[PDB]
């Protein structure tokens, strides 16, 4: 039993699990498992961080589902000011941040056999991990491209600097490789799915009729549903965890649900006629076609999908539209309604995914070079 440390600006305790949470669940099955949460400060708090409900636990270890969680709270955290004249202040703050890890981080690094750094702020601690524990296998999990996150220049330069020294760079999408300045240690590992997705998919939340589903708040475009619901009165749109309420534009054929536990979303997904990834913008990375979690979930079931053209990507059963263009929304839906359900996409479970995250060389198909 190996001991894992995950560094991320997620916190493991926050209710909507992201990819790193699912991986972390798998790590917790394999060995000790600590999740150290970064980029959280007093500043964070006065800006609406998802982690604020955890604030009274800050800087202490809390056990959550077999994971040791630590939300690091500093007074300020370094960030992209987005003003290129403020750069040397940024560099200063990132250097300062990186130079002042808490003892708990250092201890956890020392205790770890494997340290996973999620793309983002965690980059600032890769070198530190190498110094603290050169025996630790250093796994960078690229949930997102650095440029997409729009990290400070410091983090890009630092990532570029340290990236070759990482044991594993596990890209969610090969499309991320262009901006990763390393080769021999760069691997492709999607997105897992729950090993029991098919069992979770039964029963059925839906009565008779045609049901379409959207799950998730990422770039949530209510206007999609404004148009789609009006244009398709015979379709019931199930809008789950959109991060917002009932937009006044929604037709009565839209059902708006609060955030739903992942396992419970699945029946809504499996038994839908088609799913929707209503990203409000096409100013999105090319990799989002691969990295979108909801689209992966639809894909698992072969659920035809309506999504912006920019995230259709190299996939069947995705019908692109232009956000804000009613005609294209209607055309895409019209096609989705008639698309057959076929499981085109191979979806490894989270356990098999985590295996390849940790030892991609044992699975040579993951190699990008
Ligand atoms: O109330 C919710 C909202 C989101 N999700 C899931 O959370 C993941 C991420 O959703 P988000 O929109 O934030 O990102 P995306 O899927 O579009 O990448 C997706 O698999 C959703 O299916 C969920 O289970 N319940």
From Swiss-Prot:
It catalyses: alpha-D-Man-(1->3)-beta-D-Glc-(1->4)-alpha-D-Glc-1-di-trans,octa-cis-undecaprenyl diphosphate + UDP-alpha-D-glucuronate = beta-D-GlcA-(1->2)-alpha-D-Man-(1->3)-beta-D-Glc-(1->4)-alpha-D-Glc-di-trans,octa-cis-undecaprenyl diphosphate + UDP + H(+). It is a peripheral membrane protein. It comes from the Bacteria. One of its GO terms (molecular function) is glucuronosyltransferase activity. The active site is at residue 144. Changing residue 194 to A: No effect on both substrate affinity and catalytic activity. Its main location: membrane. Pfam families: GumK_N. It is found in: Cell inner membrane. Keywords: Carbohydrate metabolism, Cell inner membrane, Cell membrane, Glycosyltransferase, Membrane, Transferase. GO terms for biological process: polysaccharide biosynthetic process. GO terms for cellular component: plasma membrane. Pathway: Glycan biosynthesis; xanthan biosynthesis. Gene3D superfamilies: 3.40.50.11010, Glycogen Phosphorylase B. Disruption phenotype: Cells lacking this gene accumulate Man-alpha-1,3-Glc-beta-1,4-Glc-PP-polyisoprenyl, are unable to produce GlcA-Man-Glc(2)-PP-Pol, and show a decrease in xanthan production of more than 95%. Its EC number is 2.4.1.264. It is an enzyme of class 2 (transferase). UDP-alpha-D-glucuronate binds at residues 217-218, 259-260, 279, 293-297. Belongs to the glycosyltransferase 70 family. Catalyzes the transfer of a glucuronic acid (GlcA) residue from UDP-glucuronate to mannose-alpha-1,3-glucose-beta-1,4-glucose-P-P-polyisoprenyl to form the lipid-linked tetrasaccharide GlcA-Man-Glc(2)-PP-Pol, with a glucuronic acid-beta-mannose linkage. Is involved in the biosynthesis of the exopolysaccharide xanthan, since it catalyzes the fourth glycosylation step in the assembly of the pentasaccharide-P-P-polyisoprenyl repeating unit of xanthan. Is unable to use the trisaccharide acceptor freed from the pyrophosphate lipid moiety. This is UDP-glucuronate:glycolipid 2-beta-glucuronosyltransferase. It comes from Xanthomonas campestris pv. campestris. The lineage of its organism: Bacteria, Pseudomonadati, Pseudomonadota, Gammaproteobacteria, Lysobacterales.
């Amino acid at each position: 039993r190996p001991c894992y440390l995950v560094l991320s600006s997620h916190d493991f305790r926050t209710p909507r699990r992201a990819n790193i949470h699912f991986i972390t669940d798998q790590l917790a099955l394999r060995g000790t498992t600590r999740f150290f949460s970064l980029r959280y400060s007093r500043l964070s708090r006065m800006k609406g961080d998802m982690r604020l409900p955890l604030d009274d636990t800050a800087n202490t270890v809390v056990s959550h589902n077999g994971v040791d969680c630590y939300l690091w709270r500093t007074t300020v955290h370094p960030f992209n000011t987005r003003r290129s004249w403020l750069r040397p202040v940024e560099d200063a703050m990132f250097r300062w941040y990186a130079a002042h890890p808490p003892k708990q981080l250092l201890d956890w690094m020392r205790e770890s056999d494997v340290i996973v750094f999620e793309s983002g702020i965690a980059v600032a601690f890769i070198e530190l991990a190498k110094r603290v524990n050169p025996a630790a296998k250093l796994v960078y999990r690229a949930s997102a491209g650095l440029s997409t996150i729009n990290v400070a220049s410091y983090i890009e330069r630092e990532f570029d600097r340290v990236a070759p020294t990482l044991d594993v760079i596990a890209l969610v999408s090969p499309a991320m490789a262009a901006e990763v300045v390393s080769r021999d240690n760069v691997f492709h590992v999607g997105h897992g799915v729950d090993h029991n997705l098919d069992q979770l998919g039964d029963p059925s939340p839906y009565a008779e009729g045609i049901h379409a589903v959207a799950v998730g708040s990422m770039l949530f475009d209510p206007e999609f549903f404004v148009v789609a619901s009006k244009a398709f009165p015979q379709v019931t749109f199930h809008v789950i965890g959109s991060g917002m309420g009932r937009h006044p534009g929604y037709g009565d054929n839209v059902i708006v649900y609060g955030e739903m536990k992942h396992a419970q979303t699945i029946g809504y997904i499996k038994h839908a006629r088609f799913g929707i990834a209503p990203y409000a913008s096409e100013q999105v990375p090319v990799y989002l076609a691969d990295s979108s979690m909801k689209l992966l979930q639809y894909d698992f079931f072969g659920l035809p999908a309506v999504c912006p053209n920019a995230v259709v990507g190299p996939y069947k059963s995705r019908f692109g539209y232009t956000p804000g263009n009613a005609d294209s929304v209607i055309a895409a839906i019209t096609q989705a309604l008639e698309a057959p359900r076929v499981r085109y996409r191979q979806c490894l479970n989270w356990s098999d995914t985590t295996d390849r995250v940790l030892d991609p060389r044992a699975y040579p198909e993951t190699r990008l070079y």
